[PDB]
């Protein structure tokens, strides 16, 4: 009945949600900018930033834990190398959400969720 | 007799020397400062209006700011009163703390219970459902009949039907107080009180003998 409950389900089961967020975080890191709907971006911060915090300390154990998520060697390699040192002086708030109107296909509210600086 | 307005913090218990668990409810009560006094001459009934807590200056509207400025007290999170008991006199700006509950030994707690949303018949009026098998089709938790046949031709007022449970101002009576301490502004009362943590509660001495 959702009192003090957190985390939407997006009309998908746990397996689809985990698989989506597995690819959701990877698409963010690879391009440093990602454009999805507003509710999707909200749960994105719940998963992508914890991965970034795991990348602040470079260790074999942490990298395996970071590799366990996003199931992608490119993303874990990109972390712990520059994503760590860039944000080493920052505590939280590793991404921001910018609303960008509504889609012409289904009138869903998209949002540009991106890195703080994107180093571009 | 006058009551108090407090805030719900949580539930705990106090252990006695003989080993008895008394589940208590922690009520946090600030200095209840009187903002207005009403009498027969001006309003026709003896009651005094009181406020509790503090509110951010920007959020205080100008009409509310002037009303608080007239009483000489600062802003409060809400406004309540308690009907007088024919003989008690109070002055605007007098601040009332939890010492008034040191001898009541019985309190009434009033608050808005937690809202359960648009609840079903089973949840609202404790309807027990029908059979889930034995040929039953598309009707398990439905209310069923709603009355008679052609001859009334209508559903009576107040029929037990689907609706929200909770989110209503409700009072639970005859609650035993456990401990009063003004040095922490807390009111320990045995039992369970309506409303969730942080909800504003109205506590008054018990009217029941």
């Amino acid at each position: 009945m959702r009192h003090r409950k957190s985390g939407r389900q997006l009309n998908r089961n746990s397996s689809h949600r985990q698989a989506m967020f597995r690819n959701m975080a990877g698409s963010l890191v690879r391009h440093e900018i990602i454009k999805t709907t507003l509710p999707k971006a909200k749960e994105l911060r719940r998963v992508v930033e914890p991965l970034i915090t795991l990348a602040k300390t470079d260790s074999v154990a942490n990298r395996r834990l970071a590799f366990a998520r996003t199931r992608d060697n490119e993303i874990v390699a990109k972390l712990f190398n520059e994503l760590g040192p860039r944000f080493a002086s920052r505590a939280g708030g590793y991404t921001r959400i910018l609303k960008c109107g509504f889609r012409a296909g289904d009138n869903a509210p998209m949002a540009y969720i991106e890195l703080v600086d994107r180093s571009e | 007799m006058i009551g108090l307005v407090g805030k719900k913090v949580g539930m705990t218990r106090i252990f006695t020397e003989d080993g008895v668990s008394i589940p208590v409810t922690v009520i946090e009560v600030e200095a209840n400062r009187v903002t207005q006094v009403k009498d027969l001459a001006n309003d026709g009934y003896r009651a005094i209006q009181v406020t509790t807590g503090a509110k951010k200056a920007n959020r205080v509207t100008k009409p509310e700011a002037g009303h608080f400025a007239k009483a000489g007290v600062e802003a409060g999170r809400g406004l309540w009163e308690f009907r007088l008991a024919e003989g008690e006199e109070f002055t605007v700006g007098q601040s009332i703390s939890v010492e008034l509950f040191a001898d009541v030994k019985k309190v009434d707690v009033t608050g808005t219970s937690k809202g359960k949303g648009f609840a079903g018949t089973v949840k609202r009026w404790n309807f027990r459902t029908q059979d889930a098998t034995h040929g039953n089709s598309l009707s398990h938790r439905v209310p069923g009949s709603i009355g008679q046949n052609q001859t009334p031709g209508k559903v009576f007022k107040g029929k037990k039907m689907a609706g929200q449970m909770g989110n209503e101002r409700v009072t639970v009576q005859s609650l035993d107080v456990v401990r009063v301490d003004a040095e922490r502004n807390l009111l320990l009362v045995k039992g369970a009180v309506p409303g969730a943590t942080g909800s504003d509660l109205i506590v008054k001495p018990a009217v029941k003998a």
Binding site: - | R13, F15, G19, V20, S21
Partner: protein, 122 residues
Amino acid sequence: MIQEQTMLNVADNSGARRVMCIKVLGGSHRRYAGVGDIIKITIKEAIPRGKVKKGDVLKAVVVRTKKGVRRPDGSVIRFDGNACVLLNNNSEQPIGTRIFGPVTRELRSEKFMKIISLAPEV
């Protein structure tokens, strides 16, 4: 938490081995039997040489419930298997001679000290 047609164990040497409570006492729409109650049981399994015979319906006192009864300090007395002690019909005196297994102390409030006087465990 014992209701009608619930099979319980035996806590006395009357002769019964598998008793089943058949009706719960206390009033209208009595929900369940607690830890100390006057319960009515029927005999399904009993030794052929026992003083009680199979099929006789009579009263009993519940002695052990495996859900537990609430202690005054938020504690429950969990067990493994519900049991009774036999009783007479006209009188509430137990028929059994011995009591088997430990017995909760909350039975004192029910004034059933036949069981409490025996069963030295607890």
